[PDB]
Design an enzyme around this catalytic site. Structure first.
Site, mmCIF file in Angstrom:
data_model
loop_
_atom_site.group_PDB
_atom_site.id
_atom_site.type_symbol
_atom_site.label_atom_id
_atom_site.label_comp_id
_atom_site.label_asym_id
_atom_site.label_seq_id
_atom_site.Cartn_x
_atom_site.Cartn_y
_atom_site.Cartn_z
ATOM 1 N N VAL A 1 0.846 -1.191 0.000
ATOM 2 C CA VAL A 1 0.000 0.000 0.000
ATOM 3 C C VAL A 1 0.882 1.242 0.000
ATOM 4 O O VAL A 1 1.743 1.399 0.868
ATOM 5 C CB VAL A 1 -0.946 0.016 1.211
ATOM 6 C CG1 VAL A 1 -1.981 1.140 1.054
ATOM 7 C CG2 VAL A 1 -1.626 -1.326 1.377
ATOM 8 N N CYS A 2 0.644 2.146 -0.945
ATOM 9 C CA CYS A 2 1.290 3.454 -0.930
ATOM 10 C C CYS A 2 0.214 4.490 -1.256
ATOM 11 O O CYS A 2 -0.982 4.248 -1.077
ATOM 12 C CB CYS A 2 2.502 3.506 -1.877
ATOM 13 S SG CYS A 2 2.200 3.421 -3.678
ATOM 14 N N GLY A 3 0.644 5.655 -1.744
ATOM 15 C CA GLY A 3 -0.315 6.715 -2.024
ATOM 16 C C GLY A 3 -1.273 6.367 -3.148
ATOM 17 O O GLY A 3 -2.497 6.483 -2.997
ATOM 18 N N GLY B 1 -0.436 3.368 -5.302
ATOM 19 C CA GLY B 1 -0.171 2.002 -5.716
ATOM 20 C C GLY B 1 0.714 1.874 -6.939
ATOM 21 O O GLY B 1 1.190 0.764 -7.235
ATOM 22 N N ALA C 1 -3.745 4.203 -0.863
ATOM 23 C CA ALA C 1 -4.540 4.672 0.271
ATOM 24 C C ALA C 1 -5.131 6.056 0.050
ATOM 25 O O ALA C 1 -6.108 6.405 0.715
ATOM 26 C CB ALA C 1 -3.691 4.678 1.550
#
Lengths: 117, 118
Positions: free
Chosen positions: B53-55, B57, B97
């Site tokens: 999960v990052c800002g 993806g 996210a």
């Protein structure tokens, strides 16, 4: 700026829609292994950017990112499309014709291409 | 089955939500450079699958696919999550996210992991 737009059997119809939408602001080539052929043409300067359209966009994204030097982003919203350029400096974005609709797809292509150039 | 869940600074909160959602049905390791380390641990058998999960993806998806032998899918709907397993045989899915909400994220994780295992 030169933009390639390509789709497999599932994404060729949306690819044509995107190509026609972009033709007045970009030099578009609608050129529907696919990721490999298009990625190689981006690497050797034939195109500045490319949009690859398949069913979900996942397979072409995986395959394009396996080409050394290619950064490919699956973009299914306009915020992510802008970030693909501004953050990831992607040369290629991918979309899924079975996942998103054509009008959203056009806004995504526009949002990416406005930021990368 | 062993599932790593990991987020960067932007994705750490959602990673914890997903790990808590999954930890009763899977052997979950919440971790939270990151893409490469987790992808390598999937490749060597330490984990069977991973969720990154990052800002958006996008970055973790790019990085993970550049690990030879790893297939990573950015999955922001349950259809694509099932396709990531069933069509691309992805070991890793990624999410943003800042892009999707937590309840949709849980359904995506569940839909991917239901198809990737038997």
């Amino acid at each position: 700026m030169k933009v390639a737009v390509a789709g497999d059997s599932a994404g060729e119809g949306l690819a044509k829609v995107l190509a026609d939408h972009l033709k007045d602001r970009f030099e578009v080539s609608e050129i529907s292994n696919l990721s490999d052929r298009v990625a190689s043409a981006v690497l050797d300067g034939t195109y500045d950017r490319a949009i690859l359209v398949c069913g979900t966009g996942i397979g072409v994204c995986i395959a394009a990112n396996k080409v050394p030097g290619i950064r490919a982003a699956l973009t299914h919203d306009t915020y992510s499309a802008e970030r693909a350029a501004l953050s990831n400096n992607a040369q290629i974005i991918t979309m899924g014709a079975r996942v998103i609709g054509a009008e959203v797809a056009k806004t995504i292509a526009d949002a990416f291409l406005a930021q990368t150039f």
